[PDB]
Design a protein around this ligand. Structure first.
Ligand SMILES: Cc1cccc(N2CCCNCC2)n1
Lengths: 237, 300
């Protein structure tokens, strides 16, 4: 059933699973028209599909051309997401197809289920977790490839860089979600934190700075402080 | 007019005939039901005074033979039987009609209720849903499950209703996944109407049969089937105008006939609010909507 804090370790077992997040699939800027009305202008988006065990991210890029002439786009976006997830599954060799897919928003359950009818042995699950994958467009290189895209495009990332050489997937995942939670609550601060020390660079093939173990500990604590603070600054506590 | 005679009434039971019912005391001199209108199916149904568990009953049509009820004390129930010897049956019944030991099917003449609830129900189709082909009549009760309920256990005692499943490959064409799921017109018209049911009358007959088994026996899967067949129609943008008109009539009488005290188990809040207010056909069921809002405004 639903994924929550109690079955949290199941992410890191040896059953293939992907998270899907659709929050960045349909993106608009809202503006005033010359007549003084409001119109939306869509910008490129992405589906954030992610194997929490390996860190492989299947960033499907959603070019605004896909919304051309379409109605009820917030709804189409969930079916378009499900179409793309399903095409991704079909393209993987059998032994790489997930046994589960966990959607971060319950509205995606029925669209994915319908598209996945050909894969009855794949469980489509919701979660009770309030995960921060929406903040994934606060990762600069991810934001970059999405905004530059000129056609639909799939780009493959490892969202853990090389962390797994040194830490467990459980711990990788916790770091990642601490980074994304920080990015979501206060992006400016979160980013200041990650790059304050210009000597700690991001390898061209990575998304995050190459911190040492001790430098990650310092970082993680600063992101924690950030999240507790922005919660106080928000609720006055 | 025809007759369903009884050997006796050895246990205390409430007997239903169609939408009518009366109390019979243990070993009361009761010998059957007379003046049953020809031309319709009928259901004669039973709730023992001791064990309100298990309503049961028989769908039948008097044109398809002479049919009596004889209580069976081994199996403990009122059993429908067929008498092949017509002479014997005409004589025995005239005997009981002379001694006036039969209740009269109490049809008021202005009243088209039964016809309206059974318009498209035909015995021949009931017998395919309720497979027991040695008998011209069909046994149903409260606990019988449906062919779809068994997928999710005894197949001989099942209700073989048409399997409808909105998240199935049958319902969803590859390539129109969103289109066919939000607008089931493909499923309704091509798969079901043209493919499985053949016409709207067989479809409506199953839908009506399913309500009645829901209402008279509280058969849960029959209500599931009834709500599903409504929803398929209501969730389809393209429905022949004549089917929309007939469905408004069909449901109107089902809601009219439903016991006011049973609405909470037999009426699915979700399907009805969706049908009357969200679906393509939200504007196409005026009589159904008017009666639902004046009788059961609570559900909505
Ligand atoms: C009440 C009714 C009417 C007609 C026939 C019939 N029966 C029962 C008598 C014993 N078995 C023969 C058939 N029973």
């Amino acid at each position: 059933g639903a994924m929550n804090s109690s079955n949290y370790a199941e992410l890191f077992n040896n059953d293939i699973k992907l998270f899907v997040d659709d929050t960045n699939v349909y993106r608009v800027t809202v503006h005033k028209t010359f007549e003084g009305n409001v119109a939306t202008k869509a910008i490129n988006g992405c589906i954030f599909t992610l194997n929490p065990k390996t860190g492989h991210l299947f960033l499907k890029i959603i070019h605004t051309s896909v919304w051309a002439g379409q109605k009820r786009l917030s709804q189409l976006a969930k079916w378009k997401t499900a179409e793309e997830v399903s095409a991704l599954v079909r393209s993987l060799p059998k032994e790489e197809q997930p046994k589960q897919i966990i959607v971060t928003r319950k509205a995606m359950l029925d669209p994915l289920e319908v598209h996945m009818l050909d894969f009855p042995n794949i469980a489509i699950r919701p979660t009770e977790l309030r995960l921060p994958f929406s903040a994934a467009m606060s990762i600069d290189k991810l934001s970059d490839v999405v905004m530059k895209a000129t056609e639909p495009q799939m780009v493959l990332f490892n969202i853990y860089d090389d962390w797994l050489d040194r830490i467990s997937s459980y711990t990788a995942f916790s770091r990642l979600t601490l980074l994304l939670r920080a990015l979501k609550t206060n992006e400016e601060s979160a980013k200041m934190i990650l790059l304050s020390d210009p000597t700690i660079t991001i390898k061209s093939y990575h998304l995050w700075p190459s911190f040492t173990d001790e430098q990650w500990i310092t970082i993680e604590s600063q992101m924690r402080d950030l999240i507790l603070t922005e919660y106080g600054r928000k609720y006055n506590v | 007019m025809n007759t369903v005679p009884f050997t006796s009434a050895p246990i205390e039971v409430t007997i239903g005939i169609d939408q009518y019912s009366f109390n019979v005391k243990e070993n009361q001199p009761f010998h059957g039901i007379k003046d049953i209108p020809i031309g319709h199916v009928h259901v004669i149904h039973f709730q023992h005074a001791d064990n309100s568990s298990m309503r049961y009953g028989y769908w039948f049509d008097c044109r398809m033979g002479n049919f009596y009820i004889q209580y069976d004390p081994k199996d403990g129930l009122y059993k429908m039987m067929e008498e092949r010897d017509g002479a014997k049956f005409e004589n025995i019944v005239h005997n009981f009609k002379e001694r006036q030991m039969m209740v009269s099917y109490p049809k008021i003449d202005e009243d088209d209720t039964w016809y309206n609830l059974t318009e498209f129900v035909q015995m021949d189709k009931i017998r395919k849903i309720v497979r027991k082909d040695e008998n011209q009549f069909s046994y149903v009760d409260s606990s019988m499950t449906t062919v779809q309920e068994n997928e999710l256990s005894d197949p001989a005692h099942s209700l073989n209703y048409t399997v409808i499943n909105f998240k199935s490959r049958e319902a969803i064409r590859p390539g129109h996944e969103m289109e066919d799921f939000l607008d089931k017109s493909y499923y309704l018209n091509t798969v079901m109407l043209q493919g499985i049911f053949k016409n709207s009358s067989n479809y409506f007959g199953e839908l009506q049969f399913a309500f009645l088994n829901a209402m008279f026996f509280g058969n849960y899967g029959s209500s599931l089937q009834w709500h599903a067949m409504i929803e398929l129609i209501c969730s389809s943008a393209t429905v022949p105008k004549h089917m929309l008109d007939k469905l408004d009539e069909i449901l109107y009488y089902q809601i009219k006939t439903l016991p006011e005290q049973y609405s909470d188990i037999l009426l699915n809040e979700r399907v009805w609010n969706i049908c009357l207010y969200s679906s393509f056909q939200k504007n196409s069921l005026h009589n159904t909507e008017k009666i639902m809002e004046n009788k059961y405004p609570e559900l909505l």
